[PDB]
Design a protein around this ligand. Structure first.
Ligand SMILES: N[C@@H](CCC(=O)O)C(=O)O
Ligand SMILES: N[C@@H](CCC(=O)O)C(=O)O
Ligand SMILES: [Cl-]
Ligand SMILES: [Cl-]
Ligand code: NA
Ligand code: NA
Ligand code: NA
Lengths: 252, 253
């Protein structure tokens, strides 16, 4: 049968290029939690696949003026991919235009910052400007802030939007670097914070979770794969396999 | 000329669904309160439906009979189109999703252990390796089914014990499980969000260990229902607004 086209994005420890002196080709180039997940799905559901990194390097948001989506979300809308297997947040605005499986991981927005400071919450950031803060451009965190009517978060969006050329970044890795090299706090998904703080012992999560959401496999709206992938994820969960995969891929 | 009211099946479970305390007799939907009742009210305004709440006739969440293959509980009510929706702390599971549809989750949780304070018991593994302290779960719910189906060594040993002693250790409700913890040397396998509620109100009890699994509660619908995806959208919008968190804080030593 026809191999499914799978869009994804580089994001440690979900999807990475394998380290090797030997040049690698095709799907063999990739590893990570989401690649392990994809492999399990392919075996359970009986399909073959071809991984392609999303050409624009984006997760996906809707343009304010022209209404067009970008990123992995747009690839699915345009039927240029069959699945998006990535740390792709299931959100209200995305679910209106693409389908998602049920979640394979649950998480929420939180804050990455340096240790040792009196900053303890988003409210602490919102009331000041000396410590800058931001998020990945055209992802779910940015979109949460952009849409929020909660006073702390709407204040924070006004600031991010004002300073966007400096404080919105293209990737989580660029956000981490901004935290390490300037006085900056990064609004980041909590499962990623967990990974980063285990490896950067001067960094910490600030406060708790600001929201709650899950990562799901994306499909074009109406795809028959969406419900099949939900069943496969539920079966993996029941067996403990997703927890094992998390432990596989995830200070003094 | 109005649309038919949806029949919503549910089950008594504090603080999700309860009868209101009142000296005045109450009728119809006005009898009920709780997190799931507030959720249902929000869904009905978002989606534009009216409804009638009915407690599941057989008092069960739902499991499949291994001899005759029939389901029971709220799951069976949906299969048979005796209800339009199930709005309850109904776990989304692989075996249920094969026969009914669920919305995406409105709450995430996992199985853990409820026991009395003051003990060296620290995990399911510690319980499994002994028999002096009995343990069990709600009959014909998701926790029981997780154990019955598990191939993990600790949990399959637990199921063998629970099954052997089921007339004594499987119970009809979380409340009966709590009373067993309080009146005998018994540990109850219970969902974590319910443990959180119970231990905040009885300071003699505690959670033992962490979460054994991960799952969500979802609104159940019959397979193929058009309400499933609409309710998923309404849930995602409520979460994006922070309203589910506010509802949890309202209802929850
Ligand atoms: N995982 C996010 C990107 C990272 C973020 O927004 O914090 C998404 O699905 O858009
Ligand atoms: N909420 C569970 C019942 C309680 C339990 O099994 O622990 C269900 O959906 O079956
Ligand atoms: Cl009617
Ligand atoms: Cl779904
Ligand atoms: Na990237
Ligand atoms: Na959708
Ligand atoms: Na289903």
């Amino acid at each position: 049968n026809r191999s499914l086209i799978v869009t994804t994005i580089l994001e440690e420890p979900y999807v990475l290029f394998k380290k090797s002196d030997k040049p690698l080709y095709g799907n063999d180039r990739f590893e990570g939690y989401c690649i392990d997940l994809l492999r399990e799905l392919s075996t359970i559901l009986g399909f073959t696949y071809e991984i392609r990194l999303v050409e624009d390097g984006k997760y996906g948001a809707q343009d304010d003026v022209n209404g067009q989506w970008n990123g992995m979300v747009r690839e699915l809308i345009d039927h240029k991919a069959d699945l998006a297997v990535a740390p792709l947040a299931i959100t209200y605005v995305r679910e209106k235009v693409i389908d998602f499986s049920k979640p394979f991981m649950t998480l929420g927005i939180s804050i990455l910052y340096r240790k040792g400071t009196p900053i303890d919450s988003a409210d602490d950031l919102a009331k000041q400007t000396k410590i800058e803060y931001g998020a990945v451009e055209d992802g779910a965190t940015m979109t949460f802030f952009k849409r929020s009517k909660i006073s702390t978060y709407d204040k924070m969006w006004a600031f991010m939007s004002s300073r966007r050329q400096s404080v919105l970044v293209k990737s989580n890795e660029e956000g981490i670097q901004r935290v390490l090299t300037s006085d900056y706090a990064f609004l980041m998904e909590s499962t990623t914070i967990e990974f980063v703080t285990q490896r950067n012992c001067n960094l910490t999560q600030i406060g708790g979770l600001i929201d709650s959401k899950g990562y799901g496999v994306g499909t074009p709206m109406g795809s028959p794969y969406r419900d099949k992938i939900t069943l496969a994820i539920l079966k993996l969960q029941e067996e403990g396999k997703l927890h094992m995969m998390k432990e596989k891929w995830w200070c003094p």
